[PDB]
């Protein structure tokens with residue numbers, strides 16, 4: 001859109017006019033100058049590791065899969081790992 | 097380590113100390129019970145190969161408490177691309193003669209998956225480097241293991257901030273800079289081969305190896321680390337290869 | 351790949367967008383923003399735009415000084431890194447929303463418990479208005495963009 005008049009703010013945001021310019025107030029799930037990017041659609045590995053605790057794998061046309069390092073197993077949530085050993089690597093026993 | 101703190105005994109459980117004839121050589125990291133990663137230059141002089149030991153569980157080099165474990169280093173493998181005296185391909189994978197036992201003072205540091213290392217770990221700003229190296233350039237080595245939190249830099253920013261000359265090689269894709277330029281904090285002589293460990297969502301991973309170039313907290317310089325992401329594959333392959341009959345093995349890299 | 355340049359911060363009532371040049375010719379850009387001691391967070395993944403809304407991130411802590419960088423990847427080979435095995439990029443200026451965002455009761459893009467905060471809720475006793483003695487909003491403790499415009 002153009003200044004408020006032409007409802008620039010997408011995905012339910014509100015516009016605020018300025019000196020010709022406007023500001024879009026977006027809804028929690030969108031961002032962008034015009035509330036256009038969907039936060040909910042960037043679940044990729046380069047993006048905060050895919051939300052995976054350890055390893056991430058993006059997949060063609062399908063949701064990325066999270067994995068774990070040897071000595072660890074992925075949990076139900078599909079993102080977290082829990083050790084399957086005594087002294088799993090990268091853990092500091094006196095701090096556990 | 098200049099400007100560090102003492103790593104509270106047991107908080108750097110992956111740290112290794114290599115000694116040759118009883119003399120401190122370099123540091124190293126434990127990735128599993130028989131494998132330790134260090135820096136290839138540490139073995140540039142070694143002529144008493146069978147007198148090379150690795151100690152785990154070490155903290156205080158003056159008193160002996162229960163926790164230390166020494167193992168002879170059965171084999172030292174360095175990239176076929178390393179050139180004695182340089183700092184490129186400064187990684188060494190050591191095969192202990194007998195595995196160490198894991199205990200609260202001996203744990204391996206996770207050798208991350210490359211992608212994860214490049215895409216996620218590489219953008220974790222601070223990582224910890226540790227060792228019993230000099231506490232000041234040309235100063236006294238330490239007795240209690242020291243650790244320093246350093247910020248990592250992308251090479252553009254490193255080149256941008258370092259001063260022009262000295263016995264400074266280039267920063268290749270196999271290195272990365274981390275540190276400060278106001279000569280206050282940095283790894284130092286004695287720390288080579290030690291870890292540069294990154295903490296990511298609860299686990300620590302090996303992102304770098306203390307290499308040399310610059311001479312400890314030099315103003316206008318950052319410390320240089322071997323970028324481990326570029327060697328994961330190599331290491332893993334080596335760790336699954338069968339012993340081959342050399343103490344020093346120059347394994348093909350890539 | 352060419353690196354972005356003229357990375358600018360357009361910010362009004364905290365709605366912060368990084369803009370830069372050039373208009374990409376066969377390449378995409380991803381932006382990363384951090385605080386001096388924070389890890390870099392990526393946004394506007396492989397976009398062709400030359401702007402990146404960072405509001406969401408900077409309103410987490412308007413008093414921090416953020417730095418952002420834009421990576422340039424050839425389109426198709428988003429794994430293009432250069433000689434030092436890293437992607438080409440350029441850094442923005444530092445932006446301390448609190449001291450540099452522009453102003454115009456008003457609500458800002460800063461949020462607290464899901465809601466939005468207002469001009470006064472962010473600048474408290476640092477915000478005054480003028481009349482003559484028309485109105486203009488001023489934060490006389492700033493170095494830059496100390497007054498707003500008028501109505």
Ligand SMILES: NC(=O)NCc1cccc(-c2cccc(-c3cc4cnccc4[nH]3)c2O)c1
Nearest residue numbers: 121137138140141283284285286288307308312
């Ligand atoms: N070439 C050669 O003599 N290699 C043997 C060898 C073995 C162990 C350590 C060294 C060694 C000799 C001189 C300086 C360093 C050194 C400087 C330095 C600065 N920062 C971090 C690590 C560093 N190491 C260093 O690690 C050298």
